Every structure is written in structure tokens, then in C-alpha cells.
Amino acid sequence: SMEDQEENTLRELRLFLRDVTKRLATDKRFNIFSKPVDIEEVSDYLEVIKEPMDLSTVITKIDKHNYLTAKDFLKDIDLICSNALEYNPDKDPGDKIIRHRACTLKDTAHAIIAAELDPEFNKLCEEIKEARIKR
Predict the structure, then answer these.
(1) How many DSSP H helices and E strands does the chain contain?
(2) Phi first, then psi: what are they for 45, rounded to 5°?
(3) Residues 6 or more apart in contact with residue 57 via CB below 8 angstroms
(4) Coiled-coil ranges per the record?
(5) Separation in Å, CA 113 to CA 117, 123, 126
(6) In terms of C-beta distances under 8 Å and separation of at least 24 residues, what long-range contacts does 102-109 make, across chains too?
(7) Which CATH architecture has domain 1-135?
(8) In sequence order, what are the residues at sequence separation of 6 or more whose Cβ sits closer than 8 angstroms to the Cβ of residue 14?
(9) Closest C-alpha among 121, 112, 115 to residue 77
(10) Does residue 24 contact residue 55 with C-beta atoms inside 8 Å?
(11) Is the Cα torsion angle 1, 67, 115, 29 positive or negative in sign?
């Protein structure tokens, strides 16, 4: 029942991470990140990007209990952004549009968590993460 109680708290994190992801997913600036990059229309992607990531894959990850902290979640947002920048590094203002969007997706996600996540709640998640490592 410690397990039961721990699951309630992780559950509360998931509810919170779904609300955030949802606010990112419906912001029309982050449309290009809302879905996995198509290996039809963009055939060179999995050739250059080694770990693809997107807002809809993140939703799936929340539901598979892949995130026990807000930080594990932000890593994957960070990953969305670092891939954008790796695959789109050019002088062409199409690249710069995409990069500006990547960087704002990241910063927006970080400021949401920072403003809205109660710190003690986060500390509690961290120990549950750690306390599970140790089992």
C-alpha cells in the first residue's frame, strides 16, 4: 500500500503532465512537433536523427508510466528541440522558423513546470523515483 500510495502521487503527476502536453499540442506554433516526422515526405530523417520524439509520443509515454518526475518529461521536450536544431541548422529562414519554434516549445514547457509545479510535490516524486530504483 506504500505502492498504492506512491501510485496515487505518480497518477497526480501524470494528470499534470497531460495538461501541460495538451497546452503545447494545441498551440499552433508547435504543429510541426505535434506528430512523428514522416519518413515518407522527409526520407533522410532517421538517417540523421537517432532518437525521434514528438508531443503525441510523449502522451503515449506518460500513459506507459515512463515519467516519474517532471524532469524525466522535460528531457523529452528537450529532445524534441535538440532534434529540430540538428536537422534544421541552415541559413534559410525556413530553418530559422523551425528552430525558433523548437526553442520556444522548450522554454515554454520549462516555465510552465517552474510556475505550476509545487516543489515539495516534485521532491516527493523524486524520492519515489529513487526509492523504486532501490527496489
Answers:
(1) 6, 0
(2) -75, -60
(3) 36
(4) 2-24
(5) 5, 13, 15
(6) 102/33, 104/29, 105/24, 105/29, 105/30, 105/33, 105/77, 105/80, 105/81, 106/77, 106/78, 106/80, 106/81, 108/24, 108/27, 109/20, 109/24, 109/74, 109/77
(7) Up-down Bundle (1.20)
(8) 62, 63, 65, 67
(9) 112
(10) yes
(11) negative
Which technique was the structure solved with, according to the deposited record?
X-ray
Provide the residue type at 110 as one letter: H
What is the distance between the alpha carbons of residues 22 and 52, in angstroms, rounded to a whole number?
19
Side chain identity, residue 31: N
- Cβ proximity of 77 and 109 under 8 Å: yes
User: What is the rounded radius of gyration, in angstroms, for the C-alpha atoms of the chain?
Assistant: 16
